[PDB]
Amino acid sequence: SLQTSFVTLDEAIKITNRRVNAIEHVIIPRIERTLAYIITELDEREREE
Amino acid sequence: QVWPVRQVRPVTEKLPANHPLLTGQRVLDALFPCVQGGTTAIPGAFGCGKTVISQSLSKYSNSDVIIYVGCGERGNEMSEVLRDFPELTMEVDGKVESIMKRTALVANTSNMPVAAREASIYTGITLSEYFRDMGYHVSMMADSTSRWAEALREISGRLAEMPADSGYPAYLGARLASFYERAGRVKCLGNPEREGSVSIVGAVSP
Amino acid sequence: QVWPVRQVRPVTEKLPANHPLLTGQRVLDALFPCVQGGTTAIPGAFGCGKTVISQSLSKYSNSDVIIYVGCGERGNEMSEVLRDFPELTMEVDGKVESIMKRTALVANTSNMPVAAREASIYTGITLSEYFRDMGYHVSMMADSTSRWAEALREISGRLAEMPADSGYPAYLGARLASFYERAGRVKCLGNPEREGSVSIVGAVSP
Numbered sequence: 001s002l003q004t005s006f007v008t009l010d011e012a013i014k015i016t017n018r019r020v021n022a023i024e025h026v027i028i029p030r031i032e033r034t035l036a037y038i039i040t041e042l043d044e045r046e047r048e049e
Numbered sequence: 050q051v052w053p054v055r056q057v058r059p060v061t062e063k064l065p066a067n068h069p070l071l072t073g074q075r076v077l078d079a080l081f082p083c084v085q086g087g088t089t090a091i092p093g094a095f096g097c098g099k100t101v102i103s104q105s106l107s108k109y110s111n112s113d114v115i116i117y118v119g120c121g122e123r124g125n126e127m128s129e130v131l132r133d134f135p136e137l138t139m140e141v142d143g144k145v146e147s148i149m150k151r152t153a154l155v156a157n158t159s160n161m162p163v164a165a166r167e168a169s170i171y172t173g174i175t176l177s178e179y180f181r182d183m184g185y186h187v188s189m190m191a192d193s194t195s196r197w198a199e200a201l202r203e204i205s206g207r208l209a210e211m212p213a214d215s216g217y218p219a220y221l222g223a224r225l226a227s228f229y230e231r232a233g234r235v236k237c238l239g240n241p242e243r244e245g246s247v248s249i250v251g252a253v254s255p
Numbered sequence: 256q257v258w259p260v261r262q263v264r265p266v267t268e269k270l271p272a273n274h275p276l277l278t279g280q281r282v283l284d285a286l287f288p289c290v291q292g293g294t295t296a297i298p299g300a301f302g303c304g305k306t307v308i309s310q311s312l313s314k315y316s317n318s319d320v321i322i323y324v325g326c327g328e329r330g331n332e333m334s335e336v337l338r339d340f341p342e343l344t345m346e347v348d349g350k351v352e353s354i355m356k357r358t359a360l361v362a363n364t365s366n367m368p369v370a371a372r373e374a375s376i377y378t379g380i381t382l383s384e385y386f387r388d389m390g391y392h393v394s395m396m397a398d399s400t401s402r403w404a405e406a407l408r409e410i411s412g413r414l415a416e417m418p419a420d421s422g423y424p425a426y427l428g429a430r431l432a433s434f435y436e437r438a439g440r441v442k443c444l445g446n447p448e449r450e451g452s453v454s455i456v457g458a459v460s461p
Contacts, residue, residue, distance in 0.1 A: 047212055048422070 054171050058178055060235045067234070070248060073109025074102075085111070085186065086234040086246035093193070093254040100129070103190060107148055108137045112248070113185040115152035118173035119192035120166035120200065121159045130154065163207070166200040174231050177247050181235070184243030191251040256385075260377045263437060264384045267444040276394065276454060277317035280308075291318070291392055292440035292452040298459035305458060306332055309396045312456060313358065314343065319391040321358045324379035326372050327365040327402035336360070369406045376403055380437050383453050387441070390449025396456035400431075 052058070070085040072078045083089050093099060107115050107130075117130075134147040153176065157166055170191060177187040198221060205218040213219035234246040258264075272290035289295050299305045306328070313321045313336070323336065340355040359382065363375045376397060386393045404427055411424040419425035435455060443449035 043212075043215070048418075 052175065052179070054168065054175050057231055058182065060237050063233055063235050064244070065234070066246070071109075071111035073105045083248075086232060086248050088229055088232055088248070089250045091250060091252050093252040099252065100126075104133065104137060106188060106190075106250075107133070107152060108139055110188065111186070112188040113151075114180050114187050115148070115190075116155075116173055116176055116180075116187060117152065117190040117192070118155050118169055119190070119196075120157045120161070120169055121193055121196040122156050123158075127154065127156060163200050163203050166196065167204060170194075170197050170228070174228070178231070181245040181247050182237050184237075184241075184245050186245055187247045189247065189249045191249060193254065194251045195254040258381065258385070260374070260381045264388060265444065266441045268442055270440045270442055270450075272440055277315070279311050279315045289454070291394075292438065292454045294435055294438055294454070295456045296459055297456065298461055300461055306398060309398060309456065309458065310336065312394070312396055314339075314354070316394055317392075318394040319357070320386050320393045322361070322379060322383050322386075322393060322395045323358070324361040324375060324395065324397050325363045326376060326397065326399045327363065327367075327406075328398055330362070330364045332398075333360070333362045333364075365402070369409055372403050372406045376400075376434065380434065384437060387451040387453045388443055388449075390443055390447075390451050392452040392454075394454045394456070396458070398458045399460055400457050401460035404431075 066084040066086045068085045069078075070083045070087065072083070077083070091099070091102065103117075106112075130148070130152075134149050135145055137148055138145040139148070139151075155169060155172065157169055159166075173189055173191060177189055180187050198217060201221060201224070202217050210218055229249065229251075232247050232249050234244065236242060236244045272292050274291045276289045276291040276293070278284035278289065283289070297305050297308065309323070313323055325332065337360070340358060341353050344351050344353045346352070361375055361379055361382075363372060379395065379397065383393050383395045404423060407427060407430070408418075408423045412418070412422070416424065435457070438453050438455050440450075440452040443451050
């Protein structure tokens, strides 16, 4: 019982660790880069006005 | 004697820095030293601790004179240095002599005019220049540089300039570079051919 | 023949496209083709150097005459094309002749005067129009129209008009539309009943 639960736990832990790795190292950079772009465009428009 | 502010008194020559800046704290000295006559940047945050370096530099230091400037500060540091006149005394001769004799204070609140805040930072360099001409070694505490940047932004807004970047004017970086040009070890016009140095420690509040 | 540059040459009637414009690259021919007499745009940031794509278009093409014009590029582009075209040679119905005999150049580097560029583009379209009346197919590629836009911005700004969008004038759109409108496959006006055609390959610099 112990070792069967151990291997199932290993499967679960590797998949969830992979998921958190993916979301953290993928989703965020695009988000803050778009934040930089949007603030830059807003400031440019204001200076032109 | 009367000396205008927006320039540098000429010096005979600049020599390379060749002596460490002594610091009482062993950390920041044997790991990340600062050379005498150099330029340093320290961050500034509410409660992180800035007096820990200022007091140690004022008391325990190979420097000859201290000058503290700033804009938009409180009277609390002023009363602190008042109390440190007897307390943080250095016993070079085994006796209590006040750091007042070895230091000069200048501070401004936010009630003061914008140009006063703008020009106090230049004034610090002017005083340090006057004392480095004497053949001495100076240390500058250019507190609250971000407040100086805001004062310059306000001045430009008054004069109706274009917001080059983030509201700040165009020439901020050039002015900062000119400000930090005034440092290092030098030797000035005279008969005995003395030598001196000037170091800067600008606080930055991101 | 003395001919004003800003006035359209009269024609008989307009006609659709029927024949494909040859493209050397497998891509842009089997995927995004262009017609012999249409209009194309190639916006692309720096680094790519799409000028070489323009060179490939001029070098090989099923057209009859090729006219290259320059707007604020470097003389080195001229250097490649002038050095290379005399070397290159091809035949159609017998003897082989260098492709330099079937091409015309209008060089204009950025060091040249600013306002001259507008003129240069207009002379280019005029030359291609005259050869359109000849009863041929002429593919032109104009490089760096953004330089023309900047020059127009600059003449306006110096003349002190009120900028419309991004600092550029209020009439860039109509001017560009009219400049591109001089194109298409038409039927000439003559008893020998020629059939002319002209296409444009404008290059945009984001």
